[PDB]
Amino acid sequence: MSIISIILVLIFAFLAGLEGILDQWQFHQPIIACSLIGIATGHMAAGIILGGSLQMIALGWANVGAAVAPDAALASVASAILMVQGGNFDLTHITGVIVPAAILLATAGLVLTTLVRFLSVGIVHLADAAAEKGSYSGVAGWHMFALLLQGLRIAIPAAIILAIPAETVTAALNAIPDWVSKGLAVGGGMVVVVGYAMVINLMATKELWPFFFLGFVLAPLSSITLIGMGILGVVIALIYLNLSNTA
Amino acid sequence: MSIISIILVLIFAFLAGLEGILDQWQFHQPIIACSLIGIATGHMAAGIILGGSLQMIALGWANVGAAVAPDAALASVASAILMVQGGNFDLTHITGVIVPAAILLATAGLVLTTLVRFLSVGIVHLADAAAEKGSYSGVAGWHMFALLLQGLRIAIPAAIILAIPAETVTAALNAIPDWVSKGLAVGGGMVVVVGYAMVINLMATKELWPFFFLGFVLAPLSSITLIGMGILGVVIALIYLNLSNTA
Amino acid sequence: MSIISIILVLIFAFLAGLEGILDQWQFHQPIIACSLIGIATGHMAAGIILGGSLQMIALGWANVGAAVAPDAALASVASAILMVQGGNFDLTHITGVIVPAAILLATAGLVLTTLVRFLSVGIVHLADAAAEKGSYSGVAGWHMFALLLQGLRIAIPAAIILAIPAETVTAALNAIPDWVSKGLAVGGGMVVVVGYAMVINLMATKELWPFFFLGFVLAPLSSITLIGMGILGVVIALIYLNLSNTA
Amino acid sequence: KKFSLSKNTRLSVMFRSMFLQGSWNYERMQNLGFLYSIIPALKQFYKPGSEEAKEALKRHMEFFNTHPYVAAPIVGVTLALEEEIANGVEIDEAAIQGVKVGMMGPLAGIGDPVFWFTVRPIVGAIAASLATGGSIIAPIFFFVVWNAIRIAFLWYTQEFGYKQGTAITSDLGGGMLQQITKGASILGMFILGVLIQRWVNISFTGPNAMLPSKPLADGAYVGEWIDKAGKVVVQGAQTGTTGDGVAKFDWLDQAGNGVGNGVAGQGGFAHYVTVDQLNTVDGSTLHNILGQVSSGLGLSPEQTQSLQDVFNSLIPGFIALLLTFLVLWILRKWKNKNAPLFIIIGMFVLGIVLHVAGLA
Amino acid sequence: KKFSLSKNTRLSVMFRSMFLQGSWNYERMQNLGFLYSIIPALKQFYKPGSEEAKEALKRHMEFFNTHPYVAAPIVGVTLALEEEIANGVEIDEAAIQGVKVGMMGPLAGIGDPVFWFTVRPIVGAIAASLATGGSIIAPIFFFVVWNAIRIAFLWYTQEFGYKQGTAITSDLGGGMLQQITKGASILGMFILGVLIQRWVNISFTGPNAMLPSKPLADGAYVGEWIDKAGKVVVQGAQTGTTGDGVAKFDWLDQAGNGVGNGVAGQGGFAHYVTVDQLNTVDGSTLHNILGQVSSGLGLSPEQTQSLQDVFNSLIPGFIALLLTFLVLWILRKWKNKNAPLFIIIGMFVLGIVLHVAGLA
Amino acid sequence: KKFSLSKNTRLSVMFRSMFLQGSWNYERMQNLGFLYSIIPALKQFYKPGSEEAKEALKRHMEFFNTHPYVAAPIVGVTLALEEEIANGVEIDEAAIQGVKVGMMGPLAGIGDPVFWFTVRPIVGAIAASLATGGSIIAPIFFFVVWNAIRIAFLWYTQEFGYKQGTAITSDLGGGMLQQITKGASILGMFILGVLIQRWVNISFTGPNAMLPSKPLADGAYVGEWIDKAGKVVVQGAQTGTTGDGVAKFDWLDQAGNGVGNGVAGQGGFAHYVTVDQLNTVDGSTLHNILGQVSSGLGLSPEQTQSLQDVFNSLIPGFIALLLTFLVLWILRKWKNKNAPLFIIIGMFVLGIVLHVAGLA
Ligand SMILES: OC[C@H]1O[C@H](O)[C@@H](O)[C@@H](O)[C@@H]1O
């Protein structure tokens, strides 16, 4: 691999790690992170395809009130790097192996970020000690140091994976039998149901189930794109809210 | 015809006759009766095709409050037997001849069941006389006897039609001119209008006509199946009822 | 051109000129006027095509309260005559040249009808003077004279255009460069936006915008025709009005 | 308090209430079915031949007509009152008949539209749509779905009625059933519109009813550009329309080169020819033809239009809607008893007339 | 009570009220049309030249501007009071003018959006959609539908106004007309959205505006597997990917047998080739090609993507909606009189610019 | 009244509030981000090292957890009270903490479903739909749309909060936030139904799960009429069905003439044969085949039906809906912490089982 690709991947992984806690520019989402990693290491189409495939799983992966989500950042970065190392992008191997590996690395990233967000307590206590002296520089530096540590939490494993020889990782990835890979590919079309079900469970009522079933029934109309259905849902909501506010 | 096929047809006709008054297991419906009779006498696809074609006519053929319906039971059974006797299942003969014959046999079955349900008054009087003695066995026996008579009302004509030689019925069915057969086939695509129109006349209001026209307008969307349109109607009704109950 | 065709064109232009002020039988609309003029001078398909193309622009061209509209009458008549004189009906020349010419002639007809409806004041004063004598004949004659003058307002330019030799008008129409004709054809698919936008601007509210967006979203369902979408709009309006009147 | 009906006895009572009809009369409607349903309870309560058995059997020999499916609540209420009257409680003999008469009417009035006119037409229509192809999935669907719904309704409603006793009137009430009735009516109207549009086919193709065919154009349909001695060419950039009124085109052979340089049509170098006159279509001509048919061009040189095409261009289901409203008006104005059969015969005669006239 | 207008006189009055315009002025709008409509009634009432006739003629020479279609109720009410004033009743002379002025305003304000902005655009749009193919069904549809609606409205509303007299104000009222206005506005907004989506074509194909074409794949498009010396083969089960990074496949001739057993691509036994390079496509190769095109595979080796393709992938009618809102903002900000013509000229110039730039 | 924050300082404050997280803890949630956001205001107000700076820095060292996007109003309100406390106003020290705690809860509760569960899933789903083809339009769309919405929201809401001060509570209040939440929930449920239908593919084709193939018919599919020694014919008008039970047909060659005049099928003159056995398809046979495939006829002599075909005939997305409801029930009943991962592993095992069994 080219050296410039190596630094590009390192900066992209660092940005994804920072955004995993920042959650602002969404550099940690698979659609962004995988596409960027594909951009750095040549082939871009495979990276965007993996990002699109993994974003459906990453839907409903938000963290609320000390309930950390499965951490799509490390999943996306590590899965993209592992696919890049293994020179095969048939979109059947992407769904068969790269997506289950992404789920496992998502769990690993969740535990790693749990450790880091627990470790940040000492940094914040040191920042409070600095603020006891009335210095903006100390608290700003400690905040930036905690941010840098959280970014390194995903920067470091990317470098470790990059250090692994290409031949060994290709041999390990090819050793997977064909039948289990095809079965995992089949289950990859199911695994999005779990995330969709969490999102539904968070927001579901007897009043709102008819809208879910209406969207399900109207979906086979392929002439309407996803933006068309978004506008349709918005106008349906507007009409329903108007008619409800009449009374 | 095979002997075992003959007994199977007799039992199926008996079941259809029983259900014609029972109206519980729907063995009298063309979709069930015609398919069963086709299954018994070999060729089953033609029986299911005839049952599906005749079920559209049989829609809206319910009997309410001493207003006996056109009796789809005898129509289905006799039409299926007549088609089986005439070894031609081109689906043009099915619509041209078997469906008008089904309508005529439906009228005949209506008059026959009117006679039987009038005759059951004596059986019920005998059951009352038995109940005057405080015996459950007598009333149960008279009820079962009346039910058996109603089943025989359609079992017997099936046997009579089965006794008719195959050659004579085939000759009679073939003698129908081609032009009148094609005209009757053309009118078979119209005759379902009456069946739909009675159901529409039963439930129709200035408030509900917009839903009829909406269903008419949305029908050309062939990507939505009949179950899809059923769910769509259910969700539309739910949303309308919610918005109406808000006020 | 045939003499009988000349008389037919003159009569049709007179009818369009009368209808431009009458606004009753709609002989002035392009869908009627252009089709009639094409009927008179042989080729009818080109006339109907141009009328349909120009009718979309002519939508929203009504005149209300002394605000005279762009006068689709003279536009339709003169554009149809000019198209007929130039023996080319490729539907690219129709959109490229005949439609911008129709717009310009529409402006010219607007100014001409402004002049005529200003000139009608003297005719009406003469009618009032006649009515001062208590005679129905005088006022009826003056009304018919004003109507005849308004019809002549469009009858006369049609005759003037017909007097122009075919060779000269064909040479003038062919002299237009290909690139500008293609650009005008491209802009002819956009110019209907203004006509639609005036109608939208006249009737638009925060309550009614969702219906505009719903119609926009549901349009790609090509299985529904324009009459189907009209019935859909009517039933949607009925359901909305019912649910609003419940409260 | 002895004489407690068990779950097995109630299941047997439900399976016998499956036979609520069969002894159907005109003066005492559907009266023996109730007794046949409640036979096991009376057998468990009183032995045959006793005066108590006589009175119990004579009590349920009165008129009782209800929609068969919505009668399980009535059977459960009757079982509850039979248990009470078998436990030495004061409830009067006429109370059971009074409550049966009370819930006989409204329950049937709700049941007929919901079951016979809403559920059955929908299930049968779906079954027939599946059966159009002659597949066993359709009778299986109808039987399984209808019987599952029926068994569930009967069993659970009988259990609810037995549990609630006479208090089920405070649960059914008014307004509660009207919501179900109106929702079922909305669903039925929607489904009936769909069924009228999809299953009333009056195709007017025929050998008459064909509007005159338009020669179309010289390339608006699927075809190639044949020139004199075979070979397929493509129209090139226009070199300038001649003063006569015919444009000159470049004739590019299907290799990128140029040859001929004549005018487009018959007398010129090449003319448009449809696939019928083509021979040895092998090569890139098949690719061009496939591209043209993927574009959407028809294969006929003349655009043939029928009356059905015009009606569909207006709106699909035009004649079906007109027939539906005509039949509706006839049914609303005739007010006869055999009118539907007469209208069916009328449309059969109408189809014969249309076929002999060449329209449909 | 003599001087009773007949049905024929009322029909003539309606056919004359069809000429309500024609003597259209700027200071006394649409005033002679009313007199021309009501001439037969006055002629039947008073002979020409009398003082009564002079007063009647001078009475209806005042300003009267209303939507022409919704004026038959006014004409009928005027006929009613003309009958009353011709039967020796004491209705004051200014009462007819007062009622005419009263229903002049609201009736016009309701009829203007309903007829000119809702009914006419819808009927004309349907006619244009039918006329896109150059068929006579479209002018016939427009004329017949519009004139049937107009004649029915005029006749029936004039009859209602004549029957009701001045009491028609108690029937029109307020709120009743607002429901029609709101329903018409809803239908018009829906139809205008549909029209904007379907009839604003700004196709951005061009020679420019073409995104770079991706080589696609080696079987993702329509094509066959050619192996050196003719013949067409099919890929088989993989025998095991080689360590170099190229998988080995089984090459089955189109009979079931196995030939070659090489690698897939150029240097191997066979390579994918589209229909262009195929010769003698006769046989089962046509069946395979038809199956492929039925699957949905394109015929081009390179997936060419346009700017229009990107816009459609986002949502069809994207540029149409953007132009609609831009034009709307221009219209509500300019507040000029010739602004529409200027915007039309600007869009023609914009189309010229787009065409010369190779975009559209 | 000195110490007035400028527009540039507010822009810097917003860009720093972009870093509201990063020092995320478990006991004092998201506390340093607020100070890092409001550092420039304190620097402009008080110099480092002073007791005022000490108190200001210690004031904002308390627990503060909110949705990061809806915190700009809080930051603007805090800037307002910081200006007031730097202008000699008697606002108590705990007032800022009280207002921060007040809008900490409801704002987060409203922003969590709107942003993380409604806006983000929709934008990500659209991006993935665009990315299915491996196109750069999808990451660009996601980045641009999401960041435009985020920057606009942050900047404008911070400006509104700064302008309104503590009065923003009288504007937010209750009710309107519930309307926004309900609308977002309706849109999210609709979009989730669409996504479940469109993006859960469980195709059950397999080598198993194939229903038995029906021989179909003798012309219901795409094919020609082959007669012994080559040539293709068409069925003519029936000459009368023979008494045996086989109809006799006319065999019209593809020129208009009549040859053979036998019976239809194998032993007769001609039999139906699909495109596979055809050779030298050149001529009008290709036109006939193209017409047949345009009609809608399949190319296979035997109609092969899969389990997926049956499920689609019922309704597309049947298995997807069943899986959705099964997973919903499992998630509602398990109430564990690692349940989603276990369910995902179960789905992968289920996919392996289905593949090895030949179903999916
Ligand atoms: O509703 C009265 C009732 O009468 C009979 O029992 C049957 O025809 C039922 O189908 C009907 O519902």
Ligand SMILES: OC[C@H]1O[C@H](O)[C@@H](O)[C@@H](O)[C@@H]1O
């Ligand atoms: O509404 C006023 C009215 O004025 C004139 O009579 C015409 O332009 C009508 O179309 C318009 O409706």
Ligand SMILES: OC[C@H]1O[C@H](O)[C@@H](O)[C@@H](O)[C@@H]1O
């Ligand atoms: O809602 C509380 C809030 O807590 C943290 O800041 C993050 O997990 C946010 O995504 C979440 O919204």
